[PDB]
Amino acid sequence: MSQQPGVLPENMKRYMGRDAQRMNILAGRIIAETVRSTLGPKGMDKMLVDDLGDVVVTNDGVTILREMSVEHPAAKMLIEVAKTQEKEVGDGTTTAVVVAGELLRKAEELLDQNVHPTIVVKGYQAAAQKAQELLKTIACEVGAQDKEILTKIAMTSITGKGAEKAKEKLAEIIVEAVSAVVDDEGKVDKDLIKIEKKSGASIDDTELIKGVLVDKERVSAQMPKKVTDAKIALLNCAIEIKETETDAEIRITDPAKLMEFIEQEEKMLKDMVAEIKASGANVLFCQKGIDDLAQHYLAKEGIVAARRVKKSDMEKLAKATGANVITNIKDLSAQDLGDAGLVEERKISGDSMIFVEECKHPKAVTMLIRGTTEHVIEEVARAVDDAVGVVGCTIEDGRIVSGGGSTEVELSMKLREYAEGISGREQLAVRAFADALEVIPRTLAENAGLDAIEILVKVRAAHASNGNKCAGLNVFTGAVEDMCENGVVEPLRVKTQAIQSAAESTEMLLRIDDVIAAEKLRGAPDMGDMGG
Amino acid sequence: MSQQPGVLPENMKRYMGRDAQRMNILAGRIIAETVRSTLGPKGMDKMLVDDLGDVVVTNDGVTILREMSVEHPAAKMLIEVAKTQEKEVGDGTTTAVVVAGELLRKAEELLDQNVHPTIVVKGYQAAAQKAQELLKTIACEVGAQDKEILTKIAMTSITGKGAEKAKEKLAEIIVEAVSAVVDDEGKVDKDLIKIEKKSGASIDDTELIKGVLVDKERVSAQMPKKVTDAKIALLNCAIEIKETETDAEIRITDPAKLMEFIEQEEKMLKDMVAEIKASGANVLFCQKGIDDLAQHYLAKEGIVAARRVKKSDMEKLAKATGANVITNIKDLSAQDLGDAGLVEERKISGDSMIFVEECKHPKAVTMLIRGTTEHVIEEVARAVDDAVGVVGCTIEDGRIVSGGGSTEVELSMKLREYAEGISGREQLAVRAFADALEVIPRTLAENAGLDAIEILVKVRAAHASNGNKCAGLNVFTGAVEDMCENGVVEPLRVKTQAIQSAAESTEMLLRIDDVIAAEKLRGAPDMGDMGG
Amino acid sequence: MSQQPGVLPENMKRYMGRDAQRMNILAGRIIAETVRSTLGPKGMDKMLVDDLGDVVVTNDGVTILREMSVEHPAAKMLIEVAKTQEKEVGDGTTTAVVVAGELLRKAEELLDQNVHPTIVVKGYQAAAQKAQELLKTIACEVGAQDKEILTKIAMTSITGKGAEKAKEKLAEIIVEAVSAVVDDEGKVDKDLIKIEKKSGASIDDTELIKGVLVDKERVSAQMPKKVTDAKIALLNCAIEIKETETDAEIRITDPAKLMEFIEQEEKMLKDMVAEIKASGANVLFCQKGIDDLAQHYLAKEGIVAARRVKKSDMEKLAKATGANVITNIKDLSAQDLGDAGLVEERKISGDSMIFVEECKHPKAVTMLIRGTTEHVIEEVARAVDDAVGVVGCTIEDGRIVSGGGSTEVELSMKLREYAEGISGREQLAVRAFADALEVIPRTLAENAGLDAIEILVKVRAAHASNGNKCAGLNVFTGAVEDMCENGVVEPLRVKTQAIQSAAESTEMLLRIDDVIAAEKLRGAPDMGDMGG
């Protein structure tokens, strides 16, 4: 952890390559170590700064990568490996970026003085083919059989580690996920749960926003503050014929008798607003909704009025589910299915209070509540969604296996065992790598007594056909056995990719022991290089 | 109190983390000490400056946080803890930010050389769970039983400490609160009392503005100065058809006979102003109210005329309560309920005199008076509202318990007593913390004889089942017993959150003993760091 | 091999320590790698420079350490480890500094995250205790039994690798060593062989200077150029009573008759030079020898005259062996034993020709000849003495064992075997180290096919009780077996210390993972440090 900000020298690149890979390793190793420090289950506090700003976080890889802009043409290159795994999000991903970013060390050294990494590549991919193999239950103990609600609590156990409730915030965020799982489109489900928490006086326990938040606004001023039970209406954008389309080129040539034309236009919108009231719906929602004159009419006929630009609310409204496919200009009578009539609990916390009525229908619902205040909540608020979203992707079929709890430590003994097959070169850097896949679940260990490997022999005991699980950090050092929350992950899948991102990136990260460049500008401002 | 403005070094961050937490503690401790100095019941004078400006204050946390813009990425982070508690406002909040900001010291040291604060977190939250427990009467002596007017005087005893009237400004500001409590929306009540004091010749005793101030203006020039008993009218915004909507594109093509069109337009507004007078209301209020021609008509028919932009006055008018929901364009006859006819006591102090008549109805009324002059008043004017507002939130049910007067000192002995439960680690940093929750009510003490702890043994005497109260700073050192105003707070609630803001913030404030950052710009202007 | 000249930053030290050891390792590893490149049996060319100078070399550690003045407070510290081993000189020493400087890597990592190297120290010393054990023949094949002339040729095989005669320059330099071994004082023997080579026209094969060079001078001008068979004389410093001792204070007061005093003084030295000639010796040698007047007398009576300051020649003369213990002022007749009479072969090459007669007596003789020209010879001239000197120290008793030829590779398998003893911690970093003592004899390998380890399995075959030897680099890849010159070293001793210098230095090189300093000046010019 020296050489502050990539030591800040070597301004715009040059020089020779065979010491540069060792340089690439140095650059990749340092950023991998700083992240490793309290990341994943270690997870806690990583302090941030900048010139006037804030980014407190824990267990998040995208956030750490959001930063340290460049510092060497090696750090940026491997930000993407985390980024590639970031697609199909999670937090256990970057912890896996650490496992990949580590063995490459015993691998870069490896056969010290050999130009052919071409052997090591055959190995990592082989470990991945073994990965698809271990995807099929290798755990045996938990297997896949357990209540799904269990796997749900498991994600709540991890949360974002820095979780306020070291326990059951669980099924709160989960029921909304249990609803979200019914949608199962792969993304529209994470779109409904989307948005907030907090926005309430004080802190404490609150959650769900049951069936519909869908809007953000105290709703424009007339009396949104009043009129409880406004009713079912679902007009999502009234616009007026403000005497504009026109531009005419020339219009209203003759003087005097304009006393009609002025009154008639206000009249034209008053009739269209009276007919919309005929629906007996009343509530108005609208981005471009200002119709001031026939708004006062709408005030009499439609509880209140609203005024501006939230489109995501309309898509969120498509989730409110009031059939709002067709809404252009005039006359549509058939659709109005959005919930019941009870609306807007007024003035708590501040600014705006908005959540719609509920006439039961499971999905396409929102998810946000008072919970806790902004900064302390920002982190617990998001991590729990990552908890609700990642589980949502894997909950579907195609997978069965207990994760974590060193299920990996011996998955790797199998990898070391396959080394029995004499040829993948000889060294079986595939196996030598396996050794690391065995050392990493231990890097996770963090501490317990002091350092480690004391507990590794402990894991070796009882797995021949027994199975791995339970290794924990809480005061009680759990060798193996039940409800230590094992490896919370089952959805164990993420390892499938956590294993792959390694083999692909780590290979082209190496074998690249040439030049390291003396690059001419493609970006700016650059020109010439200095060193020779 | 050294290292002026965060010593002004370490320009844009870098370096290693394990000395940085001690650095975070140093940064949080210093700002916490400067505020502690004469804050809360100590409360008096904290001198301000800047490049051409003024901010004199006492007992206020938001004001101190308004300043010292940054000085370390630790000070800004914990400005928000005060800020989070600032929601549901008060002054006793930041005094509580001091109690939280103090023990973390015996806690940072604590188990000197232990990486696990994870134990300390279980403790602070436990103290909070005890907080919800002590919310239920632990005082016993006052309990909850006492006249509510008493608790009202209590808030007037505190005021903002720097209170001119070390006594009964009380029920003056309170009756308006007694009215405000009837509204009880949680915020609309604080909106009515809202605005001013002073604005009168000299100083002295004056208050209330009884039922309605609602407007600010000498009201436009014609004769607002005269016409006492102008009457009930409540037109809140007359606009004219200034021959504009138009733009036409082309209009008035032919010459000569325009002698009609000019006279007819002035005629069009004269008839609409004559009909509005038919209401026999007369008084006019209006943001966009200039109708110059039929204003002279309105001058004859409506005492005076007004002219510009105060919207908050209209919402304040909704509180005047003249039904002003519908007011667009023309013809509405049904509504006119705003008070009586007596209006505007002319020309005192200066600029504008404006307060409306009174035809009885309790709430939706204003609250401002001559009281004292601007700077000396600014502070006493606001603190008393914080007095009227914070009490307003808690006056509702769900709470019962005597506050202050060391009710806390022994609430904490209970916390130290629970330490009987052997495990929360061992040290029971929960208890070690309790010790501080016991030392802080003493930090409040300020002085009396000299230093303290002399009176702590005094508090220990008579609480086993007796109860705590009366510890004061006035010449008479009150051990315990009645009307020393005990702990003015009952509404004791604020402690509920004052206790919570601690446990949440203090935990993520610690456990953050890594990096302390070497941040790349997110704000501006920053780039590169200097130190290695 | 990056960070030119210690990257040239971190001007006068500061900062934190736990990344500094990794920094010390980096500094020690780099200098150890640059030296490793073609050093020892790899041995060839390492290019030098500077501001106007020359230092071409091969296999020499003192020369590489003579340079790279500082570059980090870690490089200088471990220059001395080479330096400590440099006492009792040799070239195989620094190759051994490389073996020590390498494993510390698998050892610094080792138990990754353990503060106790205290275990590793018990190991290196244990390897040394094993070293004294393997000193007793472990080779078995050569054992100790072989002609000593063989071990002599062995040193001539190594020479300084860059040897012109890839063969028998051997017994030439050796007979002089065979004589030198008779002296066996531990240093006076290396003092006789001391001085030169070259100093002759052209190059080619020449050697020995048989019994006596002892002087450097064409001998002062009169006729040193002539008078072959000058004879046995051994006057080593005639000084004159130049009328000086005096200073008198006052002398020669009266005028005129000084015609006596002038003639008498020249007379006083003429009689003392005539008596010295009575010895019938004739040849003169002298630092402070100018006696101009009775020098012309000495010219008539003593072939020639000499004139200035070579003291080392007198000690070299003590080796010529003409009893020259007593030589002050006047009259000593008893001693004159220096060789025969034949002297000075005149004018070849240039400047001076000087080598004395030979009347047989084995030791206390010189060793220098025409050989080759200065720069190409400088290196071959010295390396061969290191060849003649190091063998001279070990030729004495107390040792028996074949060296090199991987005798080490399996000496280490024994070290790995002792790891059978379960406790030296557990890891047996002693064994893990052994692994390196096994990998290093392979780092020696240099290349053969490509990289290595291909031949390691080759060494494993046939050593259980068979013995190790013969691994070579010449076209014929010799697995094991005879006259591949095995491990030329037997004198195998040097390993005794090559093994020790490691254990002592490598331990205090580590365990030093603190501060790395922020030093205030002790040298100059320094003051203040910059980084915080």
Q: Which residues contact C264 (CB under 8 A, 6 or more apart)?
A: none
Spatial separation of the C-alpha atoms in residues A280 and A232, rounded to whole Å? 9
- Quick check: B255 contacting A, CB < 8 Å? no
Spatial separation of the C-alpha atoms in residues A75 and A29, rounded to whole Å? 9
- Quick check: A252 contacting C, CB < 8 Å? no
How close is the nearest chain A Cα to the Cα of C3, in Å?
10
Assess whether A29 and A93 both reside in one domain: yes
- What's B312's DSSP letter? H
Domain boundary among A307, A339, A362: A362
Closest C-alpha among C443, C388, B187 to residue C380: C388
Judge whether C442 lies within some domain.
yes
- What's C427's DSSP letter? T
Which residue type is seen at A307?
R
Peptide bond into B525 cis (omega under 30): yes
Query: The domain spanning residue A200 has which CATH number?
Result: 3.30.260.10
Which residues of chain B make contact with A37, given a CB cutoff of 8 A? 514-515
Assess whether B354 and B369 both reside in one domain: no
Mutate to test the interface with C, among A102, A427, A453, A455 (most CBs of C within 10 A): A453
Assess whether A356 and A232 both reside in one domain: yes
- Quick check: A452 contacting C, CB < 8 Å? yes
- Quick check: B7 contacting C, CB < 8 Å? no
What residues does A235 pair with on adjacent strands? Answer: A284
The burial of C73, by beta-carbon neighbours within 10 Å (0-12 exposed, 13-18 middle, 19 or more buried), is given as: middle
- Quick check: A223 contacting C, CB < 8 Å? no
Which residues of chain B make contact with A57, given a CB cutoff of 8 A? none
- Identify the helix (H) or strand (E) that includes residue C262: helix C259-277
Paired sense of beta strands A235-236 and A284-285, if any = parallel
Mapping DSSP to helix (H, G, I), strand (E, B) and coil, where does residue C289 land?
coil
Q: Which residues contact B360 (CB under 8 A, 6 or more apart)?
A: B211
How close is the nearest chain A Cα to the Cα of C86, in Å?
29
Query: The domain spanning residue A490 has which CATH number?
Result: 1.10.560.10
How many other C-beta atoms can be found within 10 angstroms of the C-beta atom of residue C99? 23
Please tell me which chains touch C, using 3 or more CB pairs under 8 Å as the contact test: A, B
CB contact under 8 A, C2 and A9: no
- Helices C118-135 and C407-418: crossing angle in degrees, nearest 10, is 130
How close is the nearest chain A Cα to the Cα of B522, in Å?
6
Which residue type is seen at C182?
V
Measured in degrees and rounded to the nearest 5, phi and psi for residue C77 equal -55, -45
The burial of C224, by beta-carbon neighbours within 10 Å (0-12 exposed, 13-18 middle, 19 or more buried), is given as: buried
- Identify the helix (H) or strand (E) that includes residue A285: strand A284-285
Closest C-alpha among B395, B327, B482, B223 to residue A299: B327
Assess whether B235 and B280 both reside in one domain: yes
Assess whether A137 and A151 both reside in one domain: no
Spatial separation of the C-alpha atoms in residues B225 and B348, rounded to whole Å? 11
Assess whether A407 and A489 both reside in one domain: yes
Mapping DSSP to helix (H, G, I), strand (E, B) and coil, where does residue C175 land?
helix
> Resolution in A, one decimal?
4.3
**Number of domains into which chain A is organized:** 3
- Quick check: C19 contacting A, CB < 8 Å? yes
Spatial separation of the C-alpha atoms in residues B148 and B169, rounded to whole Å? 16
Spatial separation of the C-alpha atoms in residues A212 and A205, rounded to whole Å? 19
Closest C-alpha among C372, C287, C90, C318 to residue C192: C318
CB B371 within 8 A of CB B351: no
- Helices A20-36 and A92-109: crossing angle in degrees, nearest 10, is 150
Closest C-alpha among C341, C301, C479 to residue C406: C479
Judge whether B231 lies within some domain.
yes
CB contact under 8 A, A451 and C9: no
Spatial separation of the C-alpha atoms in residues C481 and C142, rounded to whole Å? 10
Closest C-alpha among A396, A390, A383 to residue A190: A390
Which residues of chain A make contact with C115, given a CB cutoff of 8 A? 451
Judge whether B525 lies within some domain.
no
Assess whether B199 and B218 both reside in one domain: no
CB contact under 8 A, B14 and A4: yes
b/e per residue B371-381 (b: at least 16 CB within 10 A): bbeeeebbbbb
Which residue type is seen at B385?
D
CB contact under 8 A, A451 and C114: yes
Judge whether B1 lies within some domain.
no
CB contact under 8 A, B500 and A203: yes
Q: Which residues contact C256 (CB under 8 A, 6 or more apart)?
A: none
CB contact under 8 A, C7 and A2: no
Spatial separation of the C-alpha atoms in residues A58 and C489, rounded to whole Å? 60
**Cα atoms in the Cβ-side hemisphere of radius 13 Å centred on A110:** 29
Which residues of chain C make contact with A115, given a CB cutoff of 8 A? 450-451
Q: Which domain holds residue A319?
A: 211-362
**What percent of the residues of chain B are helix, what percent strand, and what percent coil, each to the nearest 5?**
40, 0, 60
Closest C-alpha among A384, A459, A5 to residue A196: A384
- What's C235's DSSP letter? E
Q: Which residues contact C150 (CB under 8 A, 6 or more apart)?
A: none
Which residue type is seen at B404?
G
A residues 378-417 lying closer than 8 A (beta carbon) to B: none
What's chain C's length in residues? 532
Spatial separation of the C-alpha atoms in residues C489 and A318, rounded to whole Å? 88
Looking up tokens 């000569």, which residue turns up?
B256
Spatial separation of the C-alpha atoms in residues A411 and A489, rounded to whole Å? 15
A residues 52-111 lying closer than 8 A (beta carbon) to B: 52-56, 67-69
Closest C-alpha among A502, A500, A495, A501 to residue A134: A495
- Quick check: A114 contacting C, CB < 8 Å? yes
Question: How many CB pairs below 8 Å do chains A and C form together?
Answer: 31
CB B338 within 8 A of CB B316: no
Give the active site residue among A91, A386, A435, A513.
A386
- Quick check: B515 contacting A, CB < 8 Å? yes
Question: How many CB pairs below 8 Å do chains A and B form together?
Answer: 174
**DSSP string of A205-267?**
S----TT-----SS--TTSTTS-SS--S--EE------S-S---SS---S-S--HHHHHHHHH
Alpha helices in A37-91 (DSSP H): 61-66, 80-86
Spatial separation of the C-alpha atoms in residues C23 and C197, rounded to whole Å? 44
Judge whether C16 lies within some domain.
yes
CB contact under 8 A, B187 and A48: no
Spatial separation of the C-alpha atoms in residues B178 and C366, rounded to whole Å? 120
Spatial separation of the C-alpha atoms in residues C30 and C7, rounded to whole Å? 12
Spatial separation of the C-alpha atoms in residues A273 and A155, rounded to whole Å? 50
- What's C400's DSSP letter? B
CB A319 within 8 A of CB A268: no
Q: Which residues contact B147 (CB under 8 A, 6 or more apart)?
A: none
How close is the nearest chain C Cα to the Cα of A18, in Å?
9
How many other C-beta atoms can be found within 10 angstroms of the C-beta atom of residue A24? 22
Spatial separation of the C-alpha atoms in residues B231 and B302, rounded to whole Å? 9
Domain boundary among A350, A374, A398: A398
Query: The domain spanning residue B217 has which CATH number?
Result: 3.50.7.10
- Quick check: A448 contacting B, CB < 8 Å? no
Note every long-range contact of C335-342, with CB atoms under 8 Å and residues 24 or more positions apart, other chains counting: C335/C234, C336/C232, C336/C233, C336/C234, C336/C279, C336/C281, C337/C234, C338/C232, C338/C233, C338/C234, C339/C211, C339/C212, C339/C232, C340/C232, C341/C229, C341/C230, C341/C231, C341/C232, C342/C228, C342/C229
Assess whether B241 and B313 both reside in one domain: yes
Spatial separation of the C-alpha atoms in residues C324 and B241, rounded to whole Å? 136
Assess whether A202 and A253 both reside in one domain: no
Closest C-alpha among C15, C528, A50 to residue B11: A50
Judge whether B531 lies within some domain.
no
Paired sense of beta strands C235-236 and C284-285, if any = parallel
- Quick check: C16 contacting B, CB < 8 Å? yes
Spatial separation of the C-alpha atoms in residues A240 and A307, rounded to whole Å? 12
- Provide the terminal-to-terminal Cα distance of chain A, rounded to the nearest Å: 29
Which residues of chain B make contact with C532, given a CB cutoff of 8 A? 10, 15, 531
- Calculate the CA B190 to chain-centre distance: 9
- Quick check: A508 contacting B, CB < 8 Å? no
Query: Looking at chain A, which residue has its C-alpha nearest residue C112?
Result: A451
Catalytic residue check, A58: no
- Quick check: A446 contacting C, CB < 8 Å? no
b/e per residue C236-268 (b: at least 16 CB within 10 A): bbbebeeeeeeeeeeeeeeeeeeeeeeeeeeee
Spatial separation of the C-alpha atoms in residues B69 and B3, rounded to whole Å? 15
The burial of C370, by beta-carbon neighbours within 10 Å (0-12 exposed, 13-18 middle, 19 or more buried), is given as: buried
Judge whether A529 lies within some domain.
no
How close is the nearest chain A Cα to the Cα of B204, in Å?
36
Spatial separation of the C-alpha atoms in residues A224 and A306, rounded to whole Å? 9
Just list the catalytic residues of C. 60, 93-94, 386
Judge whether C6 lies within some domain.
no
Spatial separation of the C-alpha atoms in residues C111 and B427, rounded to whole Å? 32
Residues A39/A41/A42/A44 CA torsion (nearest 10 deg): 70
Closest C-alpha among B31, B62, B57, B61 to residue B44: B57
Which tokens in the block code for residue C285? 């040698």
Closest C-alpha among A347, A199, A228 to residue B191: A347
Spatial separation of the C-alpha atoms in residues C32 and C68, rounded to whole Å? 12
Which residues of chain B make contact with C531, given a CB cutoff of 8 A? 531-532
Assess whether A356 and A217 both reside in one domain: yes
Assess whether B358 and B221 both reside in one domain: yes
Which residues of chain C make contact with B532, given a CB cutoff of 8 A? 10, 15, 531
Assess whether A172 and A90 both reside in one domain: no
Query: Looking at chain A, which residue has its C-alpha nearest residue C427?
Result: A453
The experimental technique used to determine this model is cryo-EM
Rg (CA), chain A: 30
Which residue type is seen at B42?
K
CB B57 within 8 A of CB B63: yes
CB contact under 8 A, A111 and C19: no
CB contact under 8 A, A48 and B520: no
- What's B397's DSSP letter? S
